[PDB]
């Protein structure tokens, strides 16, 4: 559709008739995408639109089934979405959450970390772990725990599965806090395997070359790498003198024995240097190759989604001494300043971006 | 005591560790308090029970103490009135700035940015403690200044916020407060600085304001920060206001040559003093006092004569807890080194 020697951008044909403010995303592991506004949610497998009327939603694993909806302080769970062509349709579980809806607080980020459960974060920084299976395969909606004791959570990611019902989950905050939690659906307690603050380290790595990093450095996102102990971070600094924004990818290696880390590598994007004025948008890291369990490729393609652009770069998969021996390329897909990105998704080969009026764009890195 | 050809510094008590106090030369008394008691003395009674303010007598009399959301007034400090304030004490909010603007009353500001006008006299000259009005509808008030007394019980008050809102209010004990001036000067100062100092964008902050000899002109103290070179610049902006059109013009802009360090102590607030109110302006910083001179009349001979800018450097030990002033000098209250007095010979 639109291709060069490195990647392909295809428009696809999906089209949702709503409206005038949309949210949504697309989960390729479950195999379904959903898009919702203030009145209804539309679900559809990525292989017409099944509707649930009534707000932030998430699909669960079951063949088809599973929808969680958070509205205010109320969470409602339908274990089988496949058992609905009804209008109401009330075979749901409910849970009142300790969310202060009157104080302007709303749910912001949420992750599906099955078989453990669901992790939610709020605009005020609180973090909830919620269980959907209750120690007997039964479907429930119980509060697991709180993981919080002008800062906010900016990323929630899945770690490896440590056993039956147990999984690691990574949490990153805008002020530089990084945590690796072990959560489980089973009768057990949450436990922090990693709890560090990487803010000062990235700051020290940038301060000599970019003094204006002090007072402007902010973390936007993080993403795990092929090694369980390594994480990628997306930060930004701002030079108010020249009115310039710099974006930084930092590869950090963690050590669960000593609860410590070391900055492995630091890269400043050459192709995108614009500030994020729309405070509702959060730039995101995508490593599609991370989805294939048997990934045997020397190069790792990372994509960064910005409100009107997708930056594509390559690094070495193995964080060794040959890492910087070969200089890599950095390309960009410049979208029209019109497109309103409302969500994203990804599989092992490509990235999917949901616009409000241009459909679902697919970025496929040929490698 | 310590003098050169331009000014004099005279040195002129018991400990406890947070301290709060000031010195009012118009009333003629100084005040200092901790968490337990307050000491008052004309320029040494003790009152136990927190932010205090001396009121005018009706020779000696009067003291207001604010603790949490409760204010208590003694018409004579040697039988009190009480008032519950809409201050959210559980939400970590405290009273921060307070001004005696008699005969109108008392004006308070909070850490959260709310402003209270409170009356102490109630239509008969009778001592009261009633709420007059709210004047508020990461910003905070940085200066509360008295203006002219415009009649029986009425007085002008100037309010300056951190972000640049400047307001001239006409308050009175007898009414309905009316804003005579309400402008935002932040963008104007920023425009005056952005070409020469591009790093002003994102760092410009207003610290204080002071009236000038003209009712329509004010002096503003601001700071900008250069993160590249870790430098802090301080800016005196002379601004002339027009009450008819609620407008203003930047008359002049001066960057201090002699003081350029940041204020890491987030509890300190630098202060302008113009004790004649040539015009000698002093600026009190945590560990220094900058003395500069300008022309009184804001005319065309304003910048015809270049003026000197000197500094009095104190030890980095001195903990300034408050200040005051009369018509010839400025008084600075330290915690352990007494009450320093700066007298500009002119």
């Amino acid at each position, epitope marked *: 559709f639109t291709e060069n020697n490195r990647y392909i951008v295809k428009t696809l044909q999906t089209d949702y008739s709503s409206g005038d403010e949309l949210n949504g995303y697309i989960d390729m592991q479950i195999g379904y995408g959903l898009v919702n506004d203030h009145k209804k949610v539309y679900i559809w497998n990525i292989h017409p639109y099944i509707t649930v009327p009534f707000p932030r939603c998430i699909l669960t694993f079951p063949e088809t089934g599973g929808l969680i909806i958070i509205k205010g302080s109320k969470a409602i769970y339908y274990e089988d979405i496949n058992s609905i062509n009804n209008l109401n349709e009330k075979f749901s579980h409910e849970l009142e959450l300790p969310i202060n809806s009157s104080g302007g607080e709303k749910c912001d980020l949420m992750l599906n970390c099955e078989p453990a459960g669901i992790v939610l974060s709020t605009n005020m920084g609180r973090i909830f772990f919620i269980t959907i299976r209750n120690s007997m395969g039964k479907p429930q909606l119980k509060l697991g725990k709180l993981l919080n004791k002008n800062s906010s959570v900016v990323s929630l990611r899945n770690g490896p599965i440590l056993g039956k019902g147990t999984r690691l989950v990574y949490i990153t905050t805008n002020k530089g806090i990084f945590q690796t939690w072990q959560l489980s659906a089973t009768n057990s307690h949450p436990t922090k395997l990693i709890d560090v603050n990487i803010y000062e380290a990235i700051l*020290e*790595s*940038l*301060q*000599d*070359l*970019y*003094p*204006f990093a002090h007072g402007t450095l902010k973390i936007w996102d993080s993403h795990p790498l092929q090694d369980e102990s390594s994480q990628l971070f997306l930060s930004s600094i701002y*030079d108010s003198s020249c009115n310039e924004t710099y974006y930084i990818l930092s590869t950090i290696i963690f050590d669960s024995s000593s609860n410590s880390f070391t900055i492995f590598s*630091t*890269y*400043r*994007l*050459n192709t995108f240097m614009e500030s994020i004025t729309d405070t509702k948008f959060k730039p995101k890291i995508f490593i599609p190759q991370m989805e294939n369990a048997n990934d045997t490729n020397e190069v790792t393609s990372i994509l960064v989604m910005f409100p009107n652009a997708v930056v594509i770069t390559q690094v070495n998969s193995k964080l060794d001494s040959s890492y*910087s021996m070969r*200089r890599k390329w*950095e390309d960009i897909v410049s979208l029209r300043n019109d497109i309103d990105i409302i969500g994203s998704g990804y599989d092992s080969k490509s990235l999917y971006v949901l616009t409000k009026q241009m459909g679902v764009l697919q970025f496929f890195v040929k490698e | 005591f310590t003098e050169n050809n331009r000014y004099i510094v005279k040195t002129l008590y018991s400990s406890g560790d947070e301290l709060n106090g000031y010195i009012d030369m118009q009333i003629g008394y100084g005040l200092v308090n901790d968490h337990k008691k307050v000491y008052i003395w004309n320029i040494y009674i003790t009152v136990p029970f927190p932010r205090c303010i001396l009121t005018f007598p009706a020779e000696t009399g009067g003291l207001i103490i604010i603790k949490g959301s409760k204010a208590i007034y003694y018409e004579d400090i040697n039988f009190s009135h009480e008032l519950e304030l809409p201050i959210n004490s559980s939400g970590g909010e405290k009273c921060d700035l307070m001004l005696n603007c008699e005969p109108a009353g008392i004006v308070l500001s909070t850490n959260m940015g709310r402003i209270f006008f409170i009356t102490i006299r109630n239509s008969m000259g009778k001592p009261q403690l009633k709420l007059g009005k709210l004047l508020n509808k990461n910003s905070s008030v940085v200066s509360l200044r008295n203006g002219p007394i415009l009649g029986k019980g009425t007085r002008l008050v100037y309010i300056t916020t951190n972000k640049g809102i400047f307001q001239t209010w006409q308050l009175s004990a007898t009414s309905h407060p009316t804003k005579l001036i309400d402008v935002n000067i932040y963008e104007a100062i920023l425009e005056s600085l952005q070409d020469l100092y591009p790093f002003a964008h994102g760092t410009l902050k207003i610290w204080d304001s002071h009236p000038l000899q003209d009712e329509s002109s004010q002096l503003f103290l601001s700071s900008i920060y*250069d*993160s*590249s*070179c*870790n430098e802090t610049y301080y800016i005196l902006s002379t601004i002339i206001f027009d009450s008819s059109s609620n407008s203003f013009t930047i008359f002049s802009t001066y960057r201090l040559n002699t003081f350029m*360090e*940041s204020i*890491t102590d987030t509890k300190f607030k630098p202060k302008i003093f113009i004790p004649q109110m040539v015009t000698s302006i002093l600026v009190m910083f945590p560990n220094a006092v900058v003395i500069t001179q300008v022309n009184s009349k804001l005319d065309s001979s304003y910048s015809m004569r270049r003026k000197w800018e000197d500094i009095v450097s104190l030890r980095n030990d001195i903990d300034i807890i408050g200040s005051g002033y009369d018509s010839k000098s400025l008084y600075v209250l330290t915690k352990q080194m007494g009450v320093l007095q700066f007298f500009v010979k002119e």
Partner: nanobody
Amino acid sequence: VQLVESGGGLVQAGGSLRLSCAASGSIGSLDAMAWYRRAPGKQRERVASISRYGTYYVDSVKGRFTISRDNAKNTVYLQMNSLKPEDTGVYYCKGVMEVGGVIDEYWGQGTQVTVS
């Protein structure tokens, strides 16, 4: 690419030193160069830095220290005037190179500075 530091030792309170670090390698001019120090018991802090984007000093050494560097060669001098006992510590030099967005750090191995 190594960094060799010179100028350390012992000095009386109120004295002065001039630290220097000049070593280089194959690659050309470093983009930024800086002096850090680790005092006894305290943590390692940046002391001064110089780069295209500005020259930073720490408030505790401002006015007494001068970081300088010729554009032609990768040499940095730190003129330390009016020294205090609080200035005693191990001083390190740091170079930072930026090529196509790739940012690399390089550290000298330190120099002891004692003030009486």
